[PDB]
UniProtKB/Swiss-Prot annotation:
Organism annotation: Ovis aries (Sheep)
Oligomeric form and interacting partners: Monomer and homodimer. Has a tendency to aggregate into amyloid fibrils containing a cross-beta spine, formed by a steric zipper of superposed beta-strands. Soluble oligomers may represent an intermediate stage on the path to fibril formation. Copper binding may promote oligomerization. Interacts with GRB2, APP, ERI3/PRNPIP and SYN1. Mislocalized cytosolically exposed PrP interacts with MGRN1; this interaction alters MGRN1 subcellular location and causes lysosomal enlargement. Interacts with KIAA1191.
Disease with which this protein is associated in UniProt: Found in high quantity in the brain of humans and animals infected with degenerative neurological diseases such as kuru, Creutzfeldt-Jakob disease (CJD), Gerstmann-Straussler syndrome (GSS), scrapie, bovine spongiform encephalopathy (BSE), transmissible mink encephalopathy (TME), etc.
Mutation effect (residue 13 to V): In scrapie; short incubation; sA allele
Reported function: Its primary physiological function is unclear. Has cytoprotective activity against internal or environmental stresses. May play a role in neuronal development and synaptic plasticity. May be required for neuronal myelin sheath maintenance. May play a role in iron uptake and iron homeostasis. Soluble oligomers are toxic to cultured neuroblastoma cells and induce apoptosis (in vitro). Association with GPC1 (via its heparan sulfate chains) targets PRNP to lipid rafts. Also provides Cu(2+) or Zn(2+) for the ascorbate-mediated GPC1 deaminase degradation of its heparan sulfate side chains.
Subcellular localization, as worded in the UniProt entry: Cell membrane; Golgi apparatus
Residues modified by glycosylation: 61, 77
Family, similarity comment: Belongs to the prion family.
Domain of life: Eukaryota
UniProt protein name: Major prion protein
Length: 111
């Protein structure tokens, strides 16, 4: 049981997805801060869920909230810029985490 989240899960970690912001600041401003961010994302197994959308939308929403909640125990803060950059990163990582489970589920499916 994941604390009290209502039945989410957490895998392993991955490398920074290196997001193409390329805007004004979010270009370098990501690069110089991307170290102060999560390596992974809280998700669900496809076992009873089996969708893309929820594993991106709700996965970011949970993961980002669990980078504010857990971290407020340490007294931390994030500004809006940081949240959005994080959300975008977690977007790609959450797409990855769907695919992690999906590959194991697909095999127990066909080919």
């Amino acid at each position: 049981v994941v604390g009290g989240l209502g039945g989410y899960m957490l895998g392993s970690a991955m490398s920074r997805p290196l997001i193409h912001f390329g805007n004004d600041y979010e270009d370098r401003y990501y690069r110089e801060n991307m170290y102060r961010y999560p390596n992974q994302v809280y998700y669900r197994p496809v076992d009873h869920y089996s969708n893309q959308n929820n594993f991106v939308h709700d996965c970011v929403n949970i993961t980002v909230k669990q980078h504010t909640v857990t971290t407020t125990t340490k007294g931390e803060n994030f500004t809006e810029t940081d949240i959005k950059i994080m959300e975008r990163v977690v977007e790609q990582m959450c797409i990855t985490q769907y695919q992690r489970e999906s590959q194991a589920y697909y095999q127990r499916g066909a080919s």
